Amino acid sequence: MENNDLYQAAIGWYRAFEDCPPELHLCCPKVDDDDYATYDEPDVVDDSGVPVEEKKRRISAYEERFQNVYNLSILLGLGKEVAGPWLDEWTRAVDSLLKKCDTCVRNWHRNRDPYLKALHLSPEQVTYLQSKLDEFDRQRITEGLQRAKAILEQYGPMSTVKLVDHDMSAVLALYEALCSLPYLARPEHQPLFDFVFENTQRKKPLRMQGGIIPSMTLFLFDESPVRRRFAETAWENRQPGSITAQEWDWAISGRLADQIVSLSFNRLQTLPPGQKILRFWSGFLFILHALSEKQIINSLRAMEVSPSIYFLALEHLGTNSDEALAMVLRALQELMEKSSKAFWQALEQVPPNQLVEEIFKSAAFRPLLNKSLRPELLVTEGDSQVPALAAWMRALVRSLPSTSWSDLCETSLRHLFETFRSDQAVDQSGRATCTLAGLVTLQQCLDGFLQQDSIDTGTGLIMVNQLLNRVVNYSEIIIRAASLKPGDIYNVGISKAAMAIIHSALALDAKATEVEWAALIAEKPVQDAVNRDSGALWETFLEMLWAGQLGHFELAKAMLMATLRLRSIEQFIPKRKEQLKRELDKFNKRYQQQTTAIGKMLNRLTDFEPEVLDKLCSDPRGQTIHPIVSSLIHGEDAIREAGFQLLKAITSESQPSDAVGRMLEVYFTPFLNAFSQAVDKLTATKDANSPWSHMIPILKCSDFVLTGLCDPSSGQLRRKVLTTEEHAAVKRWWECVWQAVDHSFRMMRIWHIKIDKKVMEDFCRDVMELGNKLLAQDGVMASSLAQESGEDAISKAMREVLDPPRKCSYSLADMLQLRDKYLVMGIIETIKKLLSRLQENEMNLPQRTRGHLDSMLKKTKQRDGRMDYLTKTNLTDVQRIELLKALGEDAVIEEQFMGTRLIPPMDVLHQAILEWDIFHEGNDPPNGYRCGNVSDTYPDPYSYKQTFFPLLINEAWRSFVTAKDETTSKPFGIKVLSRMTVDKFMEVTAAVPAQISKDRGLTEGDIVIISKGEDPLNQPQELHCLSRIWKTTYKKDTVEVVYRLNAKGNQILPALTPGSEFQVVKITNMTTIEREYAALESLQYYDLMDEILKAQPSPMLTFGDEAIKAVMDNYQLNPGQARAILNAKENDGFTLIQGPPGTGKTKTIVAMVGCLLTGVLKLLVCAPSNAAVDELVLRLKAGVKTMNGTFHKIEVLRLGRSDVINAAVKDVTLDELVKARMDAELRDQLHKEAGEIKAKLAEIRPQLDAARLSDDRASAMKLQREFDELKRRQAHIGAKIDADKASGNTYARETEIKRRQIQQEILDKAQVLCATLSGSGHEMFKNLNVEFETVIIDEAAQCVELSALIPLKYGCNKCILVGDPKQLYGYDQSLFVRMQKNHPKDVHLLDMQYRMHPEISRFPSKEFYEGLLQDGADMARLRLQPWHQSVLLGPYRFFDVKSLVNEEEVKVAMQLYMRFRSDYRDIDLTGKIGIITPYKAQLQRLRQKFVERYGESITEQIEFNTTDAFQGRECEIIIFSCVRASGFMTDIRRMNVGLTRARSSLWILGDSRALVQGEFWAKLIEDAKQRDRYTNGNIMALLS
């Protein structure tokens, strides 16, 4: 019942309208007129105090009133006639309220359409209801418009705020008119509406709130530009998805479909207008600027109109207007960007190639580039302005699937390279734009393919090869966009794009090679789609990468960065008796070709000009320098040679060492970091096939790096100062080097069955040389790189260095298991040095290292009972004892070897010598050292230390003081190098000329007075200290001497002369002193405890004398000579025989050698003087008579100085023997070939310059091939030359090994040797194995007790010494002195003697020998030679004088000579004149007086020598003349010496009063008065 039921529903609606409160906004959620709360925030706490619950309640009240008004839409359209005045009041209320809330009016308008969709009325009924509603709305709108027009006409124009006060009702009416779709559709209302809009919208573009309308949007397409601006302003305020889907249905989707129909191609069935298409696309873009991807897929993609926006655009691609086409392309790019899925699947019916073909076929494509070239149509891409085709291609490639990218790319070629852009109808700017678009598309595709991780052998390589073939055909197009001259107007920066494309292609090829190598190594499946001519691919790029090309810096850097990728690629070694698979062989061939191409590229890079190469080498990225290091360490021989040549060119050097040093001094931190990274990468090679032969290049590179960084003089670490980052880099380098050494040893441990004897020797010996260098120069480099001051911090730095070495200590110990003798010695020396220093470094060895040491060196009982090294080690018992001493368990050493000897560290004595200033002025040292008793043996072997060590310090200070004042040298000047402090010492290195080296006599172990003052000889205020010499090599041609100078802290460290030079002069030599000190410190374990270090001297024992006459008969001995020997000869220990020198001590020594042979037949003949050694050698070797009657002799070797010696014994020097044997056992063509190759290369360089500008393809190819071949040949030749230069070390090592072997083999044939204490001071004896149980010491009275112990180092058991208490502080009195004074009974001093005149020997016996030395037998008859046969020329003529200038004395000597030549006439005194004086000035005056008064020819007639240096030497006419008293030792004991040395003529000269200091002179005068023992007076009258 429409009437009745509608009236009931209208009664309900009238209750809901009037009965419900109308004061509140009925159609809006507003509480009142001033209620402007955030009604849009019902979920949030509304500003009206309505929280989420209460704001949702306000929204629900609004929605419930809206549902009431929805059911009451029928009430509003009921009509008054049906409902009387009810619908009239409803219309009045609608006019009052619906025209009051703008949002309510918009909602009602939008819901009327929803209500119409929900209206169940017939089409006529629905039309009638809509017509009635529209009639009411139009009546209201017309009344409002009339009121507004009247107000505008009367009151004139008013601003929006003013117009609000004028008629807010008119403002609301206009707002409704802004959404009055039917009124707008009414043609009659168009005039008044247009007039009102022009009167209103002309002022400003109204920024109304609450949604938007499409009327102004259509006016944007229409002529109305004011409403166009209004629409633009309204639409430009929304963000993505800012519009509700309800609004989308209300005004967006419906109007969008309406516009699509207005442009529906199927409905149009023809081409559309250009302006229409442009406006439609522009509106779509403006709307979609605030769209959402969710609104795209779920609403836009779901907007199902014919056709859908995707298919609609697929059809509308036929829009053939130029600017419209550009806008359409931009809109398509934007749409693809919004959702790639939408573009791809919404157009899934269209293949991408079909879409590309449709797009590229644009009619306006040609002209568009002309405008695109202009700035306005220059598409703002990134920071530049390129064609919009680039944006379209980038969007397409970005949104396309990876598998779908390939074929489209080929089609993109048709668009850009093959068909469309390749057409000749393109203008210059047009062709440039097309080429730029194609290049951009190719670059985008390459970049997308780059980010891939893994794939099988698909068609990506095929696409790369197609690009390479195109850009090879487009070598012109592509490679000359790359080679385009910049600055062109048509240029669009395509040069950079082409360069980046080349770089990306190289990187992709490298990644493909890496993937293929990994798959081949892993035997994983791989397809067989395409094969890449990587050699040819790079060759195509090589033509553009040719030298001298513009912009080559970026291309070269890119090529190097790309080649850095193959840094881990390793050539797959084919198996034995197996053919590599087709894939494997293809991979090998491709790798070889790629390596050759990379080498050619590196050669061309080095071919860049020195300025160009230098500028390029300063890359801020530094990755090129990392690739340079990789090439320097590349395992391919050709790659190695190319990298060496490139590095030499870059650093501008001649040899690899110089280039390394220059690089270290230049870019130490970056080069070090890159080298560490490269070493880490290369070392990561799998241990199954890690570098076996290739590690040799790695080892050589590491050795070069060490010799560059930590060299003595040119060492960058030594010369320069480290930085914190540099410190970290150096630590990383040391750790990497030690880890590499460890890996090399461990790999050798496994490949001992795979290491060839020569190759194993080379590798192991190089490892051992690196270890020697480290434990010696990286000890120095460690001091240079100490963490901080203090033993703790420096030892911490050293322990950090040793940590990789401590881990490698297990490998080092395992290496001791080897068998090569030279390797054995090297391993033993490395173990001793490095390990003992590490133990001294206080850092305990690893528990694994200690266990391995125990299980391979410690004496444990084997299963068979062998108490030896638990793992076999053939090292000698001495070497094994040393290895045990490394652990430092002397108890274990005794219990293992001794059942219960080497050189000790000289650093103690060296530091003592260096700190103890010889120039100081302390007679008593600050320690207050003094002599004392020895008891013939200090009461402990350790008491020797505990007491004689202070005595040793006293003796060392005395020796230093004594040598201090004996310079007698020529001062010299030296240039210093650096002042680096290590262990309170420093290094002084200089390349002194060979003349300077010969003059100064500089050699290792010498002490030199390093000074800066002029004449510090008398100038204590000058700078002067002492310095020791370490080692003197030859740098190139001068002598590079590095002296281990003392850096105690004198006032010359601040005068640290990098090159400022000083005045360095040699002082003395401490080699013999060093040997003496080492022997004194070391002999505390000698078997002479009971003889030298427990309580007493050696014991004596008597025997029978039956064979004394037998010895006399067999060896010209005597019972008196035997009686003392009766105590010494049979007994053992250390025995001495006392007696005057005239008792035949030399003849008795020869007889003693004969008697020792009678008792024996290595006999060590220790002597204190070299001349006496030569005399003994003559007497013993020259006269050989064993107990057989023949010349049977023990092989005699004189291990003594032969330079200052007669040449007669020079045949037994054993050093001339060594040199002769080596000589008997014992490139230029390479240098000539290198010169010829360098000349040919220089000549080709002129041809290179000629053909470089030829620009002919065949000529360019031939010239490039010739240049590359020349570069390869030059690299090979230079590598061969450098290898020949390096071979000097190997040749020297082999020669040294052969020399040591020859020396050992020759010493093996030796049976007896004669030498001195310093003779054993040569370190070679330690490496020599000799046996000695008997020793013969000559002239014990002429040696220091300290050196006396050295002769016992050979473990002798029987020893015989020759020393008389006569003929001689007290710090070096004697060892036999203790034996005699302390135990006179235990001594055997002969009383009876021979070979002297009783008259002559009476004075020596009585005054000096205490009458014990019984004179000779019948020297008037036994020695009845002229001496006794000439009565007047008596052998003992007793005369005396009665100032040492003293024309009396000197002229008396002259007169004695004139009587020997005039009174007597035929006396020759060739070494027979006993002219001995106690003063050197007197000796010189005597020589001058002879040469003047007696004639210069008489200077050789008489021997003029000092008594002290006349030992052994014999003279017949002993005309002695003492000078004066020195003090009972050089005066009275020298007098006893003279009474023993001088034998025949008592022609004394002196004065009794002046010689009263010597009571022996008074005794001689008294005996002259008694038995004519002298005769005073003036003999000048007697000679007349």
Beta-carbon contacts of residue 935 (< 8 Å; ≥ 6 apart): 1095, 1096, 1378, 1382
Structural contact between residues 1045 and 913, judged by C-beta atoms closer than 8 angstroms: no
H or E stretch covering 470: helix 460-473
Q: Is 13 contained in some domain?
A: no
| Cα–Cα distance, 492 to 372 (Å, whole number) | 12
CA 104 to chain centre: 81
What is the token pair recorded at 605? 């890079």
Integer angstrom CA distances of residue 1082 from 949, 1150, 1319: 12, 32, 17
Integer angstrom CA distances of residue 1061 from 567, 1001, 1056, 1057: 47, 19, 10, 6
Structural contact between residues 842 and 805, judged by C-beta atoms closer than 8 angstroms: no
Is there a single domain that holds both residue 1314 and residue 1186? yes
Is there a single domain that holds both residue 1122 and residue 1040? no
- The phi and psi torsions of 1208 (rounded to 5 degrees) equal -60, -40
Q: Is 301 contained in some domain?
A: no
Residue reference for tokens 């199927």: 266
Of the candidates 498, 409, 514, 390, which has an alpha carbon nearest to the alpha carbon of residue 452? Answer: 514
SS3 1489: helix
- The phi and psi torsions of 1228 (rounded to 5 degrees) equal -60, -45
DSSP labels, 1355-1391: --SEEEEE--SS----TT--SHHHHHHH-STTSEE--
One-letter amino acid for residue 628 of the chain: I
Q: Is 1077 annotated as a binding residue?
A: no
Report the sign of the C-alpha dihedral through residues 538, 541, 542, 547, in that order.
negative
Is there a single domain that holds both residue 1357 and residue 1454? no
Is there a single domain that holds both residue 1056 and residue 1129? no
Beta bridge partners of 1517: 1473
- The phi and psi torsions of 1136 (rounded to 5 degrees) equal -135, 150
Integer angstrom CA distances of residue 941 from 305, 947, 1082, 1147: 115, 10, 11, 37
Given 1265, 1283, 1301, the domain boundary residue is 1283
Is there a single domain that holds both residue 1034 and residue 1113? no
Of the candidates 1528, 1526, 1503, 1530, which has an alpha carbon nearest to the alpha carbon of residue 1514? Answer: 1503
Q: Is 720 annotated as a binding residue?
A: no
By DSSP bridging, strand 1358-1362 and strand 1312-1315 are unpaired
One-letter amino acid for residue 78 of the chain: L
Structural contact between residues 154 and 179, judged by C-beta atoms closer than 8 angstroms: no
Is there a single domain that holds both residue 1322 and residue 1257? no
Angle separating helix axes 274-288 and 225-235, nearest 10 degrees: 30
Beta bridge partners of 1414: 1392
Angle separating helix axes 625-633 and 637-651, nearest 10 degrees: 130
Is there a single domain that holds both residue 1349 and residue 1471? no
Structural contact between residues 299 and 253, judged by C-beta atoms closer than 8 angstroms: yes
| Cα–Cα distance, 835 to 845 (Å, whole number) | 8
Structural contact between residues 1140 and 1404, judged by C-beta atoms closer than 8 angstroms: yes
- The phi and psi torsions of 354 (rounded to 5 degrees) equal -65, -40
Rounded to a whole number of angstroms, the distance between the first and last alpha carbons of the chain is: 194
Q: Is 65 contained in some domain?
A: no
Q: Is 433 annotated as a binding residue?
A: no
Q: Is 1121 annotated as a binding residue?
A: yes
DSSP 8-state class, residue 894: I
SS3 536: helix
Q: Is 1372 contained in some domain?
A: yes
CATH number at residue 1001: 2.40.30
| Cα–Cα distance, 1584 to 1575 (Å, whole number) | 17
| Cα–Cα distance, 536 to 555 (Å, whole number) | 17
| Cα–Cα distance, 316 to 1393 (Å, whole number) | 143
What is the token pair recorded at 634? 């590349």
| Cα–Cα distance, 739 to 745 (Å, whole number) | 10
Is there a single domain that holds both residue 988 and residue 1105? no
Given 1078, 1106, 1123, the domain boundary residue is 1078
| Cα–Cα distance, 490 to 710 (Å, whole number) | 57
Of the candidates 1039, 1041, 1044, which has an alpha carbon nearest to the alpha carbon of residue 1074? Answer: 1044
| Cα–Cα distance, 574 to 6 (Å, whole number) | 100
Q: Is 380 contained in some domain?
A: no
Resolution for this experimental structure (Å): 4.6
Q: How many domains does the chain have?
A: 4
By DSSP bridging, strand 1006-1011 and strand 985-992 are unpaired
Q: Is 254 annotated as a binding residue?
A: no
What is the token pair recorded at 1274? 């030059």
| Cα–Cα distance, 716 to 660 (Å, whole number) | 10
Within a 10 A sphere around the Cβ of 1171, how many other Cβ atoms? 17
Q: Is 1267 contained in some domain?
A: yes
Of the candidates 679, 729, 738, which has an alpha carbon nearest to the alpha carbon of residue 709? Answer: 729
CATH number at residue 1138: 3.40.50.300
Within a 10 A sphere around the Cβ of 657, how many other Cβ atoms? 19
Of the candidates 454, 472, 350, 480, which has an alpha carbon nearest to the alpha carbon of residue 411? Answer: 350
One-letter amino acid for residue 547 of the chain: A
SS3 1231: helix
If 0-12 CB within 10 Å is exposed, 13-18 middle and 19+ buried, where does residue 94 land?
buried
By DSSP bridging, strand 1334-1337 and strand 1163-1166 are parallel
| Cα–Cα distance, 1447 to 209 (Å, whole number) | 143
Q: Is 38 contained in some domain?
A: no
What is the token pair recorded at 656? 């690899």
Based on its alpha-carbon atoms, the radius of gyration of the chain, rounded to whole angstroms, reads: 57
Is there a single domain that holds both residue 1485 and residue 1510? yes
Continuous H helices in 1479-1558: 1480-1489, 1533-1541
Angle separating helix axes 460-473 and 428-450, nearest 10 degrees: 150
The three-state (H, E, C) secondary structure of 222-250, written as one string: CCCHHHHHHHHHHHCCCCCCCCCHHHHHH
| Cα–Cα distance, 668 to 709 (Å, whole number) | 9
Q: Is 1146 annotated as a binding residue?
A: yes
Buried b (16+ CB within 10 A) or exposed e, 108-146: bbbbbeebeeebeeeeeeeeebbeebbebbbebbeebbe
Beta bridge partners of 986: 1045
Torsion (CA) 927, 930, 935, 936 in degrees, nearest 10 = 100
Long-range contacts at 680-689 (CB < 8 A, ≥ 24 apart) = 680/736, 681/567, 681/568, 681/630, 682/567, 682/633, 682/635, 683/736, 683/739, 683/740, 683/743, 684/568, 685/570, 687/747, 687/750, 689/570, 689/573
Given 1268, 1283, 1298, the domain boundary residue is 1283
| Cα–Cα distance, 608 to 551 (Å, whole number) | 12
| Cα–Cα distance, 385 to 391 (Å, whole number) | 11
Structural contact between residues 747 and 695, judged by C-beta atoms closer than 8 angstroms: yes
Is there a single domain that holds both residue 1101 and residue 1124? yes
Continuous H helices in 607-694: 610-616, 625-633, 637-651, 656-683
Phi-psi region of 134 (alpha: psi -120 to 50; beta: other; left: phi over 0): alpha
Structural contact between residues 391 and 335, judged by C-beta atoms closer than 8 angstroms: no
What is the token pair recorded at 344? 């791809």
Beta-carbon contacts of residue 1262 (< 8 Å; ≥ 6 apart): 1251
Beta strands in 346-505 (DSSP E): 379-381, 384-386
Q: Is 1334 contained in some domain?
A: yes
Of the candidates 402, 497, 491, which has an alpha carbon nearest to the alpha carbon of residue 454? Answer: 402
Report the sign of the C-alpha dihedral through residues 1025, 1026, 1032, 1038, in that order.
positive
The residue segments making up the domain with residue 1345 are: 1097-1214+1310-1389
What is the token pair recorded at 703? 């050795």
Within a 10 A sphere around the Cβ of 1566, how many other Cβ atoms? 13
Within a 10 A sphere around the Cβ of 50, how many other Cβ atoms? 22
Structural contact between residues 1058 and 970, judged by C-beta atoms closer than 8 angstroms: no
| Cα–Cα distance, 498 to 1390 (Å, whole number) | 110
| Cα–Cα distance, 641 to 958 (Å, whole number) | 61
Integer angstrom CA distances of residue 33 from 28, 100, 171: 10, 10, 16
Q: Is 551 annotated as a binding residue?
A: no
Is there a single domain that holds both residue 1045 and residue 1171? no
| Cα–Cα distance, 1541 to 1474 (Å, whole number) | 9
| Cα–Cα distance, 226 to 204 (Å, whole number) | 8
Beta-carbon contacts of residue 199 (< 8 Å; ≥ 6 apart): 149, 152, 157
- The phi and psi torsions of 424 (rounded to 5 degrees) equal -85, 0
Q: Is 183 annotated as a binding residue?
A: no
| Cα–Cα distance, 559 to 499 (Å, whole number) | 10
Q: Is 773 annotated as a binding residue?
A: no
Structural contact between residues 335 and 342, judged by C-beta atoms closer than 8 angstroms: yes
- The phi and psi torsions of 1412 (rounded to 5 degrees) equal -65, -40
CA 927 to chain centre: 47
Is there a single domain that holds both residue 918 and residue 1014? yes
Q: Residues, the chain, total?
A: 1584
